[PDB]
Design a protein around this ligand. Structure first.
Ligand SMILES: *OP(=O)(O)OP(=O)(O)OC[C@H]1O[C@@H](N2CN(C)c3c2[nH]c(N(C)C)nc3=O)[C@H](O)[C@@H]1O
Lengths: 205, 429, 126
RNA sequence: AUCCUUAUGCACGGGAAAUACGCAUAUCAGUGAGGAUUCGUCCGAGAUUGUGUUUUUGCUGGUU
RNA sequence: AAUACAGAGAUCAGCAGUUCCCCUGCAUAAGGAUGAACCGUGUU
């Protein structure tokens, strides 16, 4: 119908010699090197372009994903963990990241500083499994670290510290709004903390 | 100019491509039309642009029009059963009165020191317990085990649904086996008095009243119970002694007499399976656990649904009543034990022990002592011990290599017998 | 639906079926799957199976009801999924399929989806 | 955040084949197509039937 | 039938297109692995 350009031949450094399309074949020898060599790269450049343009578009498209807002799951898988010490900061930090990274609702608590504590996490079942893997198999709680204090740096030996899971299960609703690490001095306000969430029972002496 | 546009318009690709732009663009908007149009909402792998095209491709072929045009009773009867309710009331009322009085009498002494010693001792005892032996039964996992009121004999039901009765202390080997007419055994229960009878429910929808003869292996069917279509999960003897209540799968728990083998009450009210029925020690009330996660109390005498309990977000397998009679305990697919004491009603209600991972099968209170300890079994392979006051978990015991279908505990509380997917029967100290 | 067959048990729900059928197909592409009755019955006798999936509405149902009794002796989980037509697709087949047995390779890529689903299925067998 | 695996889609670059590729208001077909066997068992998806094109399909360029 | 005639009547070459197959990109789906020193109920 003539809406569209008639296609010209593809040409390469193989096909180069025997294309006698009217354009400077033997006459200009190096002028026909450039045309084909330029021609080859222009095709490739297009491959590269389709890639980057598609790559970029999705990231904008990603932002719509960011905007999308949860839609409640009917059932909430959960876990619970219990340990002797949390003192190492590198451990304190991971637990804040991954919780925010994976959309895990929940909380964490413990006694004072060196006193033991508990961890709670809630989400879709895929999330928890990652986090569970982290807490047990990835992270080493028995490992030793040199902590920083207000004065300077000092060694700490946590070898006695250990972790083990208590329960995993299912709950009518997860009243935890966000994942909120905190500290309690006693064993009681610790309960009242969970108490707010009707979670007093999740702690085991 | 016309013939140029017509041939282009006549063409299938072009005909499609015109239609693609009139259809809304969102995942949800696109999706809704599909499900309404009945075609698969989603395919294997696709971005929404690919999804959208599918719409068009479907809209084109059928020549379908645009998304524009696209878009309680009281039942009477059974006087004879009516007679029984009177019996229950006379029996129930007296028993309740006696029970409450007895409970009150305990209160007066106080002398806390003795008690708080006692709990500590009990916990230590629980801490110690270990295996005695294993044993074997069959090659199907063991679905029910029960101890007689004298605690000398165990009955073990396989999935194969054959019951062999074993000797509590030693277990070795057994008395004698029978392969019952039924293939998959629900529950097995002893009559509270004579130690001459059992009862067993199973896959076939038939309950069998067994005569256990002396030291003989001549276990003798007394009678069969009919009326049940589906498999029957649980069966119990009223605390009284006269009546047997059956609870199966088709949303019918049926109250049955022992003697006449008749259907005294056909009850309805759950909307899926009903996986347990429990009778509470004054013989006043039955609480039904179900697959619909609704624990539903029932008054046998008025036949009135009383208090519905909501807490379990998966099916409720066992419903264990407490000896005191004012508390119940439930267990479920969700790995929780709820314990509801009816007296408080306004603001006490349910204390959740978080017990087990991976389900819960059978929760048991300790019979003697009015009920203090809880014992429960899930597929976690462990077995638990709980106080009835704090409901703090005290101790756990692992001797099973596999999962545990059910467990029963010695009346004194010097035995614990647990049976298991692994096909043994393990006596706990 | 239609009346789900009373002999069908454990019956997977809607949410488990999506998780199961997805594993099926994910195994089909690594050819760790085996489709059909006889192919599945072969597996158990050898001892390589992981779990069996069956069609609930298989007409008549009695033709597969032998699998459950075989599975219980080899200690192998199993469940029914609500339609055969859906199970046909997941195995990569035009046409209806009533049973399928995922197999064992313990170097496999999908190993961790499988242990996931058996864990879910064994829960249903109460 | 990096990295890795499988499937599907568009695509640069490199090969092989067109006695090959399809189509059917049509028969069956994991509720077992079609094969192998050391005879103990072992593989598991297409086979019929009618048909279209197949030393070629579309498109340009030279020279007379 | 007699006659008039006119009277024996294109080749070299290129590219894409269907079909499988490998290499390399980006996307979409599911899946995994590992790393990131910090802890949200009376003067203007
Ligand atoms: O790339 P970008 O920073 O845009 O990612 P987002 O801003 O979309 O936001 C939250 C997501 O970041 C990913 N990250 C980021 N980091 C640093 C990170 C993530 N995930 C993990 N794991 C879950 C192992 N570890 C990390 O260190 C996550 O996808 C977050 O959802």
């Amino acid at each position: 119908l003539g809406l569209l350009p008639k296609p010209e031949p593809k040409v390469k450094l193989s096909n180069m010699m025997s294309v006698f399309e009217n354009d400077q074949n033997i006459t200009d020898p190096t002028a026909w090197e450039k045309v084909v060599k330029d021609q080859v790269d222009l095709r490739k450049r297009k491959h590269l372009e389709e890639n980057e343009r598609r790559h970029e578009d999705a990231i904008k498209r990603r932002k719509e994903a960011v905007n999308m807002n949860v839609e409640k799951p009917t059932v909430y898988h959960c876990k619970v963990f219990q340990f002797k010490n949390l003192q190492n900061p590198k451990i304190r930090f991971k637990l804040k990241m991954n919780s925010k990274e994976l959309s895990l609702k929940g909380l964490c608590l413990r006694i004072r500083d060196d006193g033991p504590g508990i961890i709670i996490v809630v989400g879709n079942e895929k999330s928890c499994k990652f986090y569970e893997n982290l807490v047990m198999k990835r992270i080493k709680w028995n490992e030793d670290f040199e902590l920083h204090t207000n004065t300077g740096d000092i060694k700490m030996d946590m070898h006695n510290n250990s972790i083990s899971k208590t329960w995993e299960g299912y709950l009518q609703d997860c009243k935890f709004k966000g994942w909120f690490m905190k500290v309690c001095n006693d064993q009681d306000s610790l309960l009242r903390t969970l108490g707010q969430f009707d979670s007093e029972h999740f702690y085991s002496p | 100019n016309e013939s140029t546009a017509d041939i282009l318009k006549q063409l299938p690709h072009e005909r499609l491509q015109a239609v693609l732009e009139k259809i809304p663009e969102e995942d949800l908007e696109v999706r809704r039309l599909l499900s309404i149009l009945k075609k698969p909402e989603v395919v294997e792998n696709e971005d929404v642009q690919q999804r959208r095209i599918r719409l068009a491709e479907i809209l084109m072929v059928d020549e379908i029009d645009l998304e524009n045009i696209n878009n309680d009773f009281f039942t009477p009867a059974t006087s004879e059963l009516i007679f029984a309710r009177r019996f229950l009331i006379n029996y129930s009322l007296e028993r309740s009165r006696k029970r409450l009085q007895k409970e009150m009498e305990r209160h007066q002494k106080f002398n806390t020191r003795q008690e708080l010693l006692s709990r500590r001792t009990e916990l230590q005892r629980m801490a110690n317990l270990e295996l005695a032996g294993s044993q074997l039964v069959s090659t199907k996992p063991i679905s029910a085990v029960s101890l007689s009121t004298d605690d000398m004999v165990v009955a073990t039901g396989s999935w194969a649904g054959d019951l062999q009765v074993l000797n509590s202390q030693t277990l070795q080997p057994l008395t004698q086996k029978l392969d019952s007419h039924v293939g998959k055994i629900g529950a097995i229960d002893w009559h509270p008095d004579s130690n001459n009878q059992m009862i067993s429910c199973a896959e076939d929808g038939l309950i069998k009243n067994f005569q256990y003869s002396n030291e003989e292996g001549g276990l003798r069917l007394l009678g069969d119970l009919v009326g049940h279509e589906r498999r029957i999960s649980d069966v119990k003897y009223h605390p009284s002694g006269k009546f047997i209540g059956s609870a199966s799968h088709d949303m019918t728990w049926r109250l049955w007499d022992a003697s006449t083998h008749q259907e005294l009450l056909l009850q309805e009210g759950h909307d899926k399976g009903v996986f347990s029925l429990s009778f509470q020690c004054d013989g006043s009330l039955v609480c039904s656990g179900g697959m619909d996660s609704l624990s539903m109390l029932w008054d046998i005498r008025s036949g009135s649904k009383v208090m519905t309990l909501a807490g379990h977000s998966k099916p409720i397998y066992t419903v264990a009543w407490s000896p005191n009679g004012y508390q119940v305990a439930t267990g479920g697919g969700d790995g929780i034990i709820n314990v509801w004491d009816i007296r408080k009603r306004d603001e006490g209600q349910l204390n959740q022990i978080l017990a087990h991972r991976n389900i819960v099968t059978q929760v048991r209170f300790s019979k003697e002592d009015g009920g203090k300890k809880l014992v429960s079994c899930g597929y976690d392979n462990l077995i638990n011990v709980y106080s009835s006051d704090t409901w703090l978990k005290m101790g756990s015991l692992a001797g099973h290599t596999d999962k545990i279908i059910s467990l029963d505990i010695s009346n004194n509380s010097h035995f614990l017998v647990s049976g298991g997917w692994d096909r043994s029967i393990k006596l706990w100290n | 639906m239609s009346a789900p067959n009373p002999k069908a048990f454990p019956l997977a729900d809607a949410a488990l079926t999506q998780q199961i059928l997805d594993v099926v197909q994910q195994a089909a592409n690594l050819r760790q799957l085996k489709k059909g009755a006889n192919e599945a019955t072969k597996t158990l006798n050898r001892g390589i199976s992981e779990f069996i999936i069956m069609a609930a509405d298989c007409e008549p149902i009695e033709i597969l009801l032998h699998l459950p009794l075989l599975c219980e002796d080899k200690n192998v989980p199993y469940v029914f999924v609500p339609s055969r037509v859906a199970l046909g697709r997941a195995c990569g087949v035009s046409r209806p399929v009533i049973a399928a047995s995922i197999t064992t390779n313990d170097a496999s890529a999908i190993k961790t989806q499988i242990y996931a689903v058996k864990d879910k299925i064994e829960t249903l067998l109460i």
